[PDB]
Amino acid sequence: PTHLSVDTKFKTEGLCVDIPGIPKDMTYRRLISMMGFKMNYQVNGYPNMFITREEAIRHVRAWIGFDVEGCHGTNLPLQLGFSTGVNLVAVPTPLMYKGLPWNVVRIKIVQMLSDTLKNLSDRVVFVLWAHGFELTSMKYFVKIGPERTCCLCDRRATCFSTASDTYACWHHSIGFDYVYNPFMIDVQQWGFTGNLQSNHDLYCQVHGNAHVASCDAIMTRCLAVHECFVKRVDWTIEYPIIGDELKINAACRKVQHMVVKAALLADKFPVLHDIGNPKAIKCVPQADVEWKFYDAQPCSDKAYKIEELFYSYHSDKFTDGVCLFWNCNVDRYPANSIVCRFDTRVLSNLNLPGCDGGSLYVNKHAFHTPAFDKSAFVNLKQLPFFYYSDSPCESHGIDYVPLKSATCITRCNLGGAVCRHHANEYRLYLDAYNMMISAGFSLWVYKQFDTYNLWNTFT
Ligand SMILES: CC1CCN(C(=O)c2cc3ccccc3o2)CC1
Ligand SMILES: [Zn+2]
Ligand SMILES: [Zn+2]
Ligand SMILES: [Zn+2]
């Protein structure tokens, strides 16, 4: 039960308008053969062009929605649409390109996939809502065979060049003309009633239908993301490290401790209501405060309604003390809150386009996050940068330029000049802070929060 068997059945009903007379009885083995490919009884790591839903979920970073719409099959020009928003027109002699022959179209395809995927995945997974032309056009830009490595590096080959007879990964494919050993999944095989637009529109209002192939390619990948990450959630699937994952997670832990410690010192709340992670630990273990935990898993569809989290009869009084919502996305935060909210609009290799304005944030695990909404924070203000420390001014053990900063809240800065230890610690914390902010996180705090109240914690 590793890969999808080629002898598995393929429902051909969705294919019979572009392919009239298609047999109802059909396997992946026969379909691949009909697509013009020959698998030659090869036991070399590529057992099937098509993959299982479980394999697609593990390779979500590789997903590229793909759709082909006939402008006028062998005689008529095709419109190739991709979930990148690209539309290429191929002649057989929302970015719209004029009609060009396949020999130049395939070059643009390799360029586009390589630029989109090089920092995301070792492969491409073509996400389809298959009607016929997308499958029968694959032979014009795809070559298959045994699993290979890049000519210039150790990564698996994802491209082929007919000019040099060589193979390359997404990083070394400049001037390559064929997509090598791609993967694909037909969403129509999952059991749906009705056309793509009707099933997509049940869950998403952000993607519209202009009737161009890229629009359908976008709706397909969106529907696939809703099915695999919004309605069905799996926090047991690990994902490889492709960027600053560890540094961002470490920075997040440092910022949480810093912000929560300072709020408890500035406003001395008697109780803290920690809403979120059922496996959460006190971020400030030495604080005097009464720490009360409330379990809520990450919401992947719509943000939690504060009325359902707090009401229906716990301290009961959430109005007492402070509330901490560290990645616990709610519709409107109460005024007495400390909040970390991920901004779904952020551009990064970790954040993939999602469903209904939301985004698929992939960092060790995949978390579909509801659309960032500025109105959730009307009772709060943006938390400004500050570094706070009550640790002794003692260096122990990198060089030095004297630090001067109004936001270095330490005994040394209070007393006039920042010590070397607190200057090192301040710069490291500011680096972690910028990492976390640029990863897409946003910090919000109750309006009375004032760092001026921290200077008196040194007396
Ligand atoms: C897009 C965000 C990125 C950071 N996330 C978490 O670190 C996380 C883990 C967890 C477990 C339970 C409740 C909330 C939780 O947030 C997921 C959300
Ligand atoms: Zn390479
Ligand atoms: Zn959508
Ligand atoms: Zn100091």
From Swiss-Prot:
<feature type="active site">
    <location>
        <position position="134"/>
    </location>
</feature>
<comment type="function">
    <text>Plays a role in viral RNA synthesis through two distinct activities. The N7-guanine methyltransferase activity plays a role in the formation of the cap structure GpppA-RNA. The proofreading exoribonuclease reduces the sensitivity of the virus to RNA mutagens during replication. This activity acts on both ssRNA and dsRNA in a 3'-5' direction.</text>
</comment>
<feature type="binding site">
    <location>
        <position position="150"/>
    </location>
    <ligand>
        <name>Zn(2+) 14</name>
    </ligand>
</feature>
<feature type="binding site">
    <location>
        <position position="153"/>
    </location>
    <ligand>
        <name>Zn(2+) 14</name>
    </ligand>
</feature>
<feature type="active site">
    <location>
        <position position="67"/>
    </location>
</feature>
<feature type="binding site">
    <location>
        <position position="422"/>
    </location>
    <ligand>
        <name>Zn(2+) 16</name>
    </ligand>
</feature>
<feature type="domain" description="N7-MTase">
    <location>
        <begin position="239"/>
        <end position="459"/>
    </location>
</feature>
<feature type="binding site">
    <location>
        <position position="69"/>
    </location>
    <ligand>
        <name>Mg(2+) 2</name>
    </ligand>
</feature>
<comment type="subunit">
    <text>Interacts (via N-terminus) with DDX1. Interacts with nsp10.</text>
</comment>
<feature type="region of interest" description="GpppA-binding">
    <location>
        <begin position="355"/>
        <end position="369"/>
    </location>
</feature>
<feature type="binding site">
    <location>
        <position position="412"/>
    </location>
    <ligand>
        <name>Zn(2+) 16</name>
    </ligand>
</feature>
<feature type="domain" description="ExoN">
    <location>
        <begin position="49"/>
        <end position="230"/>
    </location>
</feature>
<feature type="active site">
    <location>
        <position position="211"/>
    </location>
</feature>
<feature type="binding site">
    <location>
        <position position="216"/>
    </location>
    <ligand>
        <name>Mg(2+) 2</name>
    </ligand>
</feature>
<feature type="binding site">
    <location>
        <begin position="274"/>
        <end position="280"/>
    </location>
    <ligand>
        <name>S-adenosyl-L-methionine</name>
    </ligand>
</feature>
<protein>
    <recommendedName>
        <fullName>Guanine-N7 methyltransferase nsp14</fullName>
    </recommendedName>
</protein>
<feature type="binding site">
    <location>
        <position position="211"/>
    </location>
    <ligand>
        <name>Mg(2+) 2</name>
    </ligand>
</feature>
<feature type="binding site">
    <location>
        <position position="222"/>
    </location>
    <ligand>
        <name>Zn(2+) 15</name>
    </ligand>
</feature>
<feature type="binding site">
    <location>
        <position position="207"/>
    </location>
    <ligand>
        <name>Zn(2+) 15</name>
    </ligand>
</feature>
<feature type="binding site">
    <location>
        <position position="169"/>
    </location>
    <ligand>
        <name>Zn(2+) 14</name>
    </ligand>
</feature>
<feature type="binding site">
    <location>
        <position position="172"/>
    </location>
    <ligand>
        <name>Zn(2+) 14</name>
    </ligand>
</feature>
<feature type="binding site">
    <location>
        <position position="200"/>
    </location>
    <ligand>
        <name>Zn(2+) 15</name>
    </ligand>
</feature>
<feature type="active site">
    <location>
        <position position="69"/>
    </location>
</feature>
<feature type="active site">
    <location>
        <position position="216"/>
    </location>
</feature>
<feature type="binding site">
    <location>
        <position position="393"/>
    </location>
    <ligand>
        <name>Zn(2+) 16</name>
    </ligand>
</feature>
<feature type="binding site">
    <location>
        <position position="134"/>
    </location>
    <ligand>
        <name>Mg(2+) 1</name>
    </ligand>
</feature>
<feature type="binding site">
    <location>
        <position position="204"/>
    </location>
    <ligand>
        <name>Zn(2+) 15</name>
    </ligand>
</feature>
<feature type="binding site">
    <location>
        <position position="419"/>
    </location>
    <ligand>
        <name>Zn(2+) 16</name>
    </ligand>
</feature>
<feature type="binding site">
    <location>
        <position position="67"/>
    </location>
    <ligand>
        <name>Mg(2+) 1</name>
    </ligand>
</feature>
